[PDB]
Design a binder for this molecule. Sequence first.
Ligand code: 8M7
Length: 331
Amino acid sequence: TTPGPVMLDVVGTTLSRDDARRLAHPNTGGVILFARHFQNRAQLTALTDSIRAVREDILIAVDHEGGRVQRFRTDGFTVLPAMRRLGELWDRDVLLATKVATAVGYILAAELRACGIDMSFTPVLDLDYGSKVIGDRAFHRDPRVVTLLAKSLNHGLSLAGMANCGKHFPGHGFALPTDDRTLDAILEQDVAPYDWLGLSLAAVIPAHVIYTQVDKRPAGFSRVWLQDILRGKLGFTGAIFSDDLSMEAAREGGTLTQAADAALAAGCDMVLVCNQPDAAEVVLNGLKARASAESVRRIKRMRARGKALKWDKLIAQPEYLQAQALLSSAL
Ligand SMILES: CCC(CC)C(=O)N[C@H]1/C(=N/OC(=O)Nc2ccccc2)O[C@H](CO)[C@@H](O)[C@@H]1O
């Protein structure tokens, strides 16, 4: 009853017999939700409940960053702003920006927790260099601003008992994309938020980027980035999730199973295989690596903390209503 290294997804709004088989697999350790898994809050809450009934130790995550990346947007879910908005608020009022960032984090996490979800793959720590796929998903250009805005956000997530996951290490702001900058330049700017956050950073997603001047391998498959730099230089002790291995160029010509074993060997504690459960099931049965005691420890600390308010109580909570007003007033 310990988490496995694979995070996959399920078939739809309710669990099928095939989902139950996959969830019960020892190498399964997480479920990532998408828009297709949300009809309404009642259905979503029932799904997460049924997932934990099959596998009590499972980690349930979702991409809730705000702006362009928010899977659940209806039936009462607060539409959250793009993180770039907070960087814009910082430039006009630093202290207010931190205050709002916390309110955004609390709403974000409180609403997910009311529906039985453990965590969100947020914040994005990539610097806003001016990448269309990142775009307004980044907080700011200045790594010191990204750090303190992200720190304030993760604080709000923590108020609801929710962890966090910075991405995409060591920096996606600047076949698989390449980055021909030197280690020093990458460290001095893009990595700085990861280092400065300290214990405020609970997990990392490495980017599917070749940092040519640093290592032949992508960050997610790089022992240099993950072991030497992230765990070694930065002393990071949190969980490392691979970025979606379903990307064509991520496999580098190999199978999903080989890419999964490579990421886990490089330093990943858990691999993501999204939008193809049958392919993820092949990985479950073909994976050579098994969850270690130290990886299990890190995965377990990503679970949500404490009791969550049900939706009917949350929307009338003073703190919740205070966050809403602050968000409405500042943006
Ligand atoms: C720097 C942007 C980067 C871009 C990589 C990105 O946005 N990465 C996201 C991602 N993207 O996953 C695919 O792009 N998969 C795909 C896309 C097209 C076809 C098949 C699979 O994965 C995980 C799991 O959701 C997210 O938390 C990541 O933030």
